[PDB]
């Protein structure tokens, strides 16, 4: 359905439109990495949705940010010292840390509420490529689905390189790294990715002018205003003073057209006002 429109534009690097991920899904309306967290996303016409994979004692995988379930569930422990039986058990806190009646979902189910509406990026499932690659061919969504980490090129052909024409995967560089550079452009030469997500902690970083002309119409540049440290303090607290001072300055200086936030329904208002996003 939806999913397919959103496709066409990540795969336009000339795209003049702003995709937007909801970090964890809408959380801010229902539990984070929980399926109502996703068709809340869903409901309010986000593009991407980010999830966390952990995987259980017994080798399923969940969505899950921490290594334990203090933070966002009833239980407490290792995820990894946990069935996902008993996990099942559980149920998640809201924003507020009241107990609801959502569980866990696993990433199956994650998959399935997803499925034709909206775009998906794991994170922490780049290690676990191969076993996430059977859930997506399972739940038949292999064409929606953003994988992403931080290795080479050299190293992700390595090791999973017989799924690269199989799945969208999108590097994550930190231009904080003295070879950032060669890493992103060793990408764009032997992958020629739809996006990459760039990480930036100081200001005055001087690289990421340098990557707008680099990826100046060959791919989408990804940034995140979750928190300071990710895009030289153009965040989410900046953007609710001076939208134009964080969102504005990633989009028309750094070329951002998609942008990782933890208020979605904001970042869509200021797009839709911009005309960048229907």
Do not use: C
């Not at 930036?200 to 940034?223: A, G, V």
Request: charged share 30%; proline share 4%; glycine share 6%.
């Amino acid at each position: 359905g939806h999913v397919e429109t959103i496709k066409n534009t990540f795969l336009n690097p000339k795209s003049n439109k702003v995709l937007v991920v909801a970090h964890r899904g809408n959380w801010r309306s229902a539990p984070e990495n929980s399926t109502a967290a996703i068709d809340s996303a869903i409901a309010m016409k986000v593009d991407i949705v980010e999830i966390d994979i952990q995987k259980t004692k017994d080798g399923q995988l969940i969505l899950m940010h921490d290594n334990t379930l203090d933070r966002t569930t009833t239980g407490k422990g290792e995820i990894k010292n946990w069935t996902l039986a008993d996990i099942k058990k559980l149920k998640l806190k809201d924003k507020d840390g009241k107990v609801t009646n959502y569980v866990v979902p696993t990433l199956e189910e994650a998959l399935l509420t997803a499925k034709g509406k909206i775009m998906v990026n794991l994170d922490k499932a780049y290690d676990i490529f191969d076993d996430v690659y059977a859930i997506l061919e399972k739940t038949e969504t292999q064409n929606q689905v953003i994988m992403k980490g931080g290795q080479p090129i050299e190293t992700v052909k390595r090791e999973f390189g017989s799924y690269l024409d199989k799945v969208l995967y999108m590097p994550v560089i930190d231009l904080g790294n003295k070879e950032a550079e060669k890493i992103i452009t060793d990408y764009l030469k032997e992958l020629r990715p739809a996006a990459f997500e760039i990480i930036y902690s100081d200001p005055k970083n001087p690289l990421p002018p340098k990557i707008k002309q680099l990826l100046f119409k060959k791919s989408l540049i990804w940034y995140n205003t979750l928190w300071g440290s990710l895009a030289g303090n153009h965040d989410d607290n900046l953007a609710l003073t001076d939208p134009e001072k964080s969102y504005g300055y990633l989009i028309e200086q750094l070329g951002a057209r998609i942008l990782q936030t933890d208020q979605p329904a904001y970042l869509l208002d200021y797009l839709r006002k911009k005309g960048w996003h229907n």
